[PDB]
């Protein structure tokens, strides 16, 4: 059933990524024993909830889910309200709020809009975080686009504490669609994932959020490039090898 | 019925398996809670019929 | 929880949503998860056949050197399919995708002519295309149905793609009402899962004359439509590239340099 999980994950590399939500819930119905793991391994399009209390938006993912509730990085409350959901230590909550600000500036500089959310949670020897970002297009040219970032980072502090080890697993979902007399309906969707593993110095001048940010930055810069190569280059070249306007020599 | 031929060479690797884990207190009631996606239904239904 | 019935309903659903060239993998995955082969055999049975018929799965019949498409228009019932070119029934295995037991079979002249012009057309424009033409009566009216399937399977480089076109010319001389569905799917799955899903509908009305004359007009009409479709798709890719994508994430901030995280955290 480590074997089952694999098959499950293999299947999800293959079913139209556009229907991940319905496919995942169907998949868990098929193999319930994989519920907890399927929910933390299968990426879904990010959703947005309003945080009434502060009237700000935030992003949803298994990592801020408990019961059927999601926690706001603003007010730190669960919604719907939940009796004793997982919470960061007050220490961690403090850093988390600081990672939220830090990455709101990141979001701004690189996306010039969109939403961001950062959720941290405690680990035995360090912590983990997930940095989430969503940016939609304008609908200029009747083409819809949405960009989804999911950066899940593990941080291993060593007793020295002069350094830490960082495991970043990064996903971006890119979603484009259009209906033109052309052409007709066209939906180009999916996601790329990549891992990094680095040791960085943790100091007052080089803090965790700086280290993590720099990783998340190298990574998106990379993936942005590959998304551009894959979507509008590779899948394009494939379409044009199925059929040719010009008669074949 | 039995296992059919695969021409892929190697198994696919799932990176999200190895991510950090977050223990919850209350487990999900449903996989979803409370559009990417447009045109995709009719791709699997549209027919000259 | 759910019944074993709902389990196969789910299993079947997944199979029919298998991407081009990936039926075998999706099948292996589902069968392991269901973990009940006679439940699979029983329950997904309809799925296998739909998949091949929907996908316009092509098959070689030993003896003929024209490949034939599995399509619901060729569905003779009871495991068999028709090959209108060579006028034969053949048994077809939906999991192995093999034809067997070719047997003789019983708008002839128009399907023939249309067929000829279409083979010509397919061999010119589709690198690995095949086609199949049916002439039949649908609820009192005589119709030509021209299916085209073409694909490229590159499993070793984690990608597959397929074009299908399906054209229905229902003939009421001197007019023919034209309907067509065009479908393209591309899947690239290295370190991810990106898919193109496209389809265009066509409704039109056209002139009709003699078998041979008419056939050529039909093929010239088809060629035209499939160019607009393909061209427009290429245009979409270009607008997506240089307009929409760039509006999602900048390549660098406006400062033309990477972020100063020291400054950020101040």
Which distant-in-sequence residues (6+ apart) come within 8 Å of A13 by Cβ?
B12, B14, C189, C192, C193
**Structure-block tokens of residue C265:** 């955290």
3-state helix vs strand vs coil in chain A, percent to 5: 40, 35, 25
Specify the CATH number for the domain of residue C111: 3.90.1150.210
* CA–CA distance, A192 with A185 (Å, rounded to integer): 23
Instruction: Give the residue on B whose Cα is nearest the Cα of A25.
Output: B31
Token pair belonging to A53: 């209390």
DSSP state of C192: B
- Is the sign of the CA dihedral C121, C126, C127, C132 positive or negative? negative
**Dihedral angle computed from the Cα positions of residues C204, C208, C213 and C214, in that order, rounded to the nearest 10 degrees:** 40
**Distance from C-alpha of C144 to C-alpha of C155, rounded to nearest angstrom:** 35
Q: Shortest Cα distance from C104 to chain A (angstroms)?
A: 33
Chain breaks in chain A (C to N over 2.5 A) after: none
3-state secondary structure of C54: helix
Nearest to C138 by CA among C172, C174, C175: C172
CA distances from C132 to A61, A106, A200, C78, C153 (A): 48, 56, 62, 20, 21
Whether residues C130 and C98 fall in one domain? no
**Neighbours, chain A (3 or more CB pairs < 8 A):** B, C
Give the span between the Cα atoms of C115 and C69, in whole angstroms: 13
Query: What determination technique applies here?
Result: X-ray
* Residue C131, domain member (yes or no): yes
C-alpha distances (whole Å) from C135 to each of A151, A234, C168, C220 are 56, 38, 10, 19
A30, A113, A185: best to mutate for the C interface, most C CBs within 10 A: A30
**Burial grade of C164 (CB within 10 A; 0-12, 13-18, 19 or more):** buried
Q: How many domains does chain B fold into?
A: 1
Are C177 and C220 in contact by the 8 Å Cβ rule? The answer is: no
Residues C113 and C238 placed together within one structural domain of the fold: yes
Q: Which chains touch B (3 or more CB pairs under 8 A)?
A: A, C
C-alpha–C-alpha distance, residues C110 and C108, integer Å: 6
User: How many pairs of residues across B and C have Cβ atoms under 8 Å apart?
Assistant: 55
The answer to whether residue B46 neighbours chain A at the CB level (below 8 Å) is no
Q: What is the CATH number of the domain that holds C82?
A: 3.30.1140.60
Residue C181: give the domain boundaries: 107-248
Quick check: is C156 in a domain? yes
Q: How far is C84 from chain A (nearest CA, A)?
A: 24
Q: What is the resolution of this structure in A?
A: 2.7
Min distance A203 CA to chain B CA atoms (Å): 24
Contacts of A2 (CB under 8 A, 6+ apart): none
Strand partners, A134: A115, A148
Instruction: Give me the residue spans of the domains in chain A.
Output: 1-88, 89-249
Same domain, C54 and C121: no
Q: Does C175 fall in a domain?
A: yes
Both C234 and C131 in one domain: the answer is: yes
Both C38 and C152 in one domain: the answer is: no
Touching C: A residues 122-141, CB under 8 Å: 135, 137-138, 140-141
Q: Decide if C194 and A192 are in contact by the 8 Å CB cutoff.
A: yes
Q: How far apart, in whole angstroms, are the C-alpha atoms of residue A187 and residue A13?
A: 17
C230, two tokens: 């393909």
Instruction: Please name the member of B15, B25, B38 whose beta carbon is closest to the beta carbon of A169.
Output: B15
Sole residue written with tokens 């900048």: C250
Alpha-carbon span C238 to C224, nearest angstrom: 21
* Pairwise CA distance, residues B28 & A62, whole Å: 10
Spatial distance between the Cα atoms of C74 and A61, rounded to a whole number of angstroms:
47
CA dihedral C32, C36, C39, C45 (to 10 degrees): 30
Q: Same CATH fold, A89-249 and A1-88?
A: no
CA C89, C95, C100: angle at the middle one, nearest 5?
30
Q: Which of residues 56-75 of A touch B (CB under 8 A)?
A: 62-63, 65-70
Q: Which residue in C has a C-alpha nearest to residue A218's C-alpha? A: C258
> Which residues 193-252 in chain C show a CB within 8 A of chain A?
193-201, 226-241, 243-245, 247-251
* Best residue in A11, A18, A149 for a mutation probing chain C (most C CBs within 10 Å): A11
A2: closest CA of chain B, how far (Å): 10
Q: Are residues C112 and C192 in the same domain?
A: yes
Q: How far is B2 from chain A (nearest CA, A)?
A: 16
Q: Measured between CA atoms, how close is C109 to chain A, in angstroms?
A: 27
A205, two tokens: 């001048």
Q: 3-class DSSP state for residue A242?
A: helix
Residue where a domain stops, chosen among C54, C85, C106: C106
> Does the domain spanning A1-88 belong to CATH 3.40.50.620?
no
Say what angle helices C45-55 and C4-16 make with each other, to 10 degrees: 10
Of C140, C108, C68, C32, give the one whose Cα is nearest residue A6: C32
Q: Which residue of C has its CA nearest to B14?
A: C191
Report the DSSP beta bridge partners of residue C194: C188
Pick the CATH number of A89-249 from 3.10.129.10, 3.90.1150.210, 3.30.559.10, 3.10.450.50: 3.90.1150.210
Helix (H, G, I), strand (E, B) or coil at C183: strand
The torsion angles phi and psi of C178, rounded to 5 degrees, stand at: -110, 125
Q: Structurally, how many domains does chain C consist of?
A: 2
User: Angle, to 10 degrees, between the axis of helix C4-16 and the axis of helix A20-30?
Assistant: 140
Residue in the block written with tokens 């056209």: C206
CB contacts of A13 in chain B (<8 Å) are: 12, 14
């Amino acid at each position: 059933s480590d074997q089952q999980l694999d098959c499950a994950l293999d299947l999800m590399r293959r079913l139209p990524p556009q229907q991940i939500e319905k496919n995942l819930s169907d998949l868990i119905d098929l193999v319930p024993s994989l519920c907890e793991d399927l929910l933390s391994s299968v990426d879904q399009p990010l959703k947005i909830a309003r945080d009434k209390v502060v009237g700000k938006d935030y992003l949803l993912c298994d990592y801020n889910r408990d019961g059927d509730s999601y926690r706001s990085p603003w007010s730190n409350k669960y919604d719907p309200p939940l009796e004793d959901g997982a919470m960061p230590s007050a220490r961690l909550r403090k850093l988390e709020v600081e990672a939220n600000n830090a990455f709101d500036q990141y979001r701004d500089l690189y996306f010039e809009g969109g939403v961001s959310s950062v959720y941290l949670w405690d680990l035995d020897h360090g912590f983990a975080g997930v940095i989430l970002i969503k940016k939609a297009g304008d609908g200029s040219k009747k083409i819809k686009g949405c960009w989804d970032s999911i950066h899940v980072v593990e941080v291993q502090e060593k007793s020295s504490g002069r350094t830490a080890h960082y495991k970043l697993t990064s996903t971006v979902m890119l979603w484009l669609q259009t209906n033109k007399t052309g052409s007709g309906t066209m939906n180009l969707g999916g996601s790329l994932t990549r891992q990094m593993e680095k040791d960085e110095t943790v100091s007052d001048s080089s803090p965790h959020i700086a280290n993590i940010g720099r990783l998340v930055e190298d990574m998106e810069n990379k993936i942005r490039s590959t998304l551009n190569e894959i979507y509008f280059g590779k899948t394009k070249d494939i379409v044009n090898g199925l059929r040719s306007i010009d008669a074949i020599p | 019925i039995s296992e059919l031929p695969s021409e892929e060479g190697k198994k696919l690797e799932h990176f999200t398996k190895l991510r950090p884990k977050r223990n919850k207190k209350q487990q999900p009631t449903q996989a979803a809670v409370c559009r990417v996606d447009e045109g995709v239904d009719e791709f699997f239904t549209k027919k000259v019929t | 929880r759910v019944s074993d019935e709902e389990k196969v309903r789910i299993a079947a659903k997944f199979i029919t949503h298998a991407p081009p060239g990936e039926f075998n993998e999706v099948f292996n995955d589902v069968r392991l998860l269901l973990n009940n082969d006679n439940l699979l055999r029983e329950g997904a049975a309809h799925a296998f056949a739909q998949y091949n018929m929907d996908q316009f799965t092509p098959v070689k019949i030993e003896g003929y050197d024209d490949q034939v498409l599995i399509t619901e228009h060729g569905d003779l019932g009871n495991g068999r399919f028709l090959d209108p070119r060579n006028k034969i029934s053949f048994k077809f295995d939906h999991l192995r995708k093999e034809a067997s037991d070719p047997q003789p079979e019983d708008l002839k002249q128009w399907r023939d002519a249309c067929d000829s012009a279409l083979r010509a057309y397919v061999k010119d424009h589709y690198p690995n295309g095949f086609c199949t033409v049916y002439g039949k009566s649908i609820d009192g009216q005589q119709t030509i149905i021209a299916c085209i399937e073409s694909h490229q399977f590159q499993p070793k480089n984690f990608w597959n793609g397929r074009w299908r076109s399906e054209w229905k010319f229902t003939i009421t001389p001197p007019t023919a009402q034209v309907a067509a569905v065009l479908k393209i799917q591309v899947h690239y799955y290295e370190d991810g899962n990106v898919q193109l899903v496209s389809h265009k509908d066509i409704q039109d009305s056209v002139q009709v004359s003699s078998d041979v004359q008419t056939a050529k007009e039909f093929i010239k009409i088809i060629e035209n439509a499939e160019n607009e479709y393909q061209t427009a798709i290429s245009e979409n890719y270009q607008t997506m590239s240089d307009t929409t994508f760039k509006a999602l994430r900048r390549q660098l901030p406006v400062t033309r340099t990477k972020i100063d995280w020291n400054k950020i955290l101040s």
